[PDB]
Amino acid sequence: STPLVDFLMQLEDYTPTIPDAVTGYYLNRAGFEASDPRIIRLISLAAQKFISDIANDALQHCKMKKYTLTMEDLTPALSEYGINVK
Amino acid sequence: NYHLARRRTLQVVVSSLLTEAGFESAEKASVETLTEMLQSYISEIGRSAKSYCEHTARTQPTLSDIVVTLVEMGFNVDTLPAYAKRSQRMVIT
Ligand SMILES: [Cl-]
């Protein structure tokens, strides 16, 4: 129970792989700004996971033939992130 | 310069994420693709969060606002807590 709010609280403890400054730069570039540094860290982790999910998707393809990420395996993992389909 | 520094930072981030995912190598094109997608996703969150928070009467964005923004974007927030615990172990080299 409450696994999410537990995560949100200790965001101040986590140090994401992406520096706060870098995430901040790209957010401030989209016109978004936040003083709570936990907001920056939340966004950093979400962005990281977004890429991790793609990497894992790619790996699953690579397992369909010690591991090299190729465009052959990465391309299919991008199917949801192309041109906007109506 | 600053753009170079950012690109290098994201390269290392992507490198770490690929290493954690179980890759030992990667085609340059694939690293470049994910570096681009990473910075663009952060910006997308920013636009979405901006759009969302402009509806609230509070000057300061809240963590709650951002969670809702991610949901609006179709991000599965339920899985983040588990992911965050692994990431903390992660190392850059
Ligand atoms: Cl840039």
Residue numbers in the entry:
A (entry chain A): 113 to 177, 192 to 212
B (entry chain B): 28 to 120
Sentences from the paper on this structure:
We determined the structure of this complex by the Sulfur-SAD method and refined the model to a crystallographic R value of 20.5% and a free R factor of 23.7% with excellent stereochemistry. In our structure, TAF8 wraps entirely around the α2 helix of TAF10 markedly enveloping its interaction partner. As observed in other HFD interactions, the two opposing aromatic residues Y68 of TAF8 and F162 of TAF10 at the crossover of the α2 helices contact each other via hydrophobic stacking interactions and categorize the complex to the H3/H4 family of HFD-containing proteins. The additional N-terminal α-helix of TAF10, αN and the C-terminal α-helix of TAF8, αC, contact each other on one side of the HFD in a head-to-tail fashion and significantly stabilize the complex by hydrophobic interactions centred on F119 of TAF10. In both proteins, a phenylalanine of loop L1 (F50 in TAF8 and F144 in TAF10) is embedded in a composite, hydrophobic cavity mainly formed by residues from helices α1/α2 of one protomer and helices α2/α3 of the other. The pseudosymmetric L1 loops are characteristic for the TAF8–10 complex, since similar arrangements cannot be found in the crystal structures of the Drosophila TAF6–TAF9 and the human TAF4–TAF12 complex suggesting that the overall shape and precise geometry of the complex is important for integration into core–TFIID.
Among these HFD pairs, the TAF8–10 heterodimer plays a key role in the TFIID assembly pathway, is critical for the integrity of holo–TFIID and also fulfills essential functions in early embryonic development. By immunoprecipitating TAF-containing complexes from different cellular compartments, we identify a novel endogenous TFIID subcomplex formed by TAF2, 8 and 10 in the cytoplasm of human cells. Taken together, our data suggest the presence of a nuclear import particle in which the TAF2–8–10 complex is bound by the major binding site of Importin α1 via the NLS of TAF8, poised to shuttle into the nucleus.
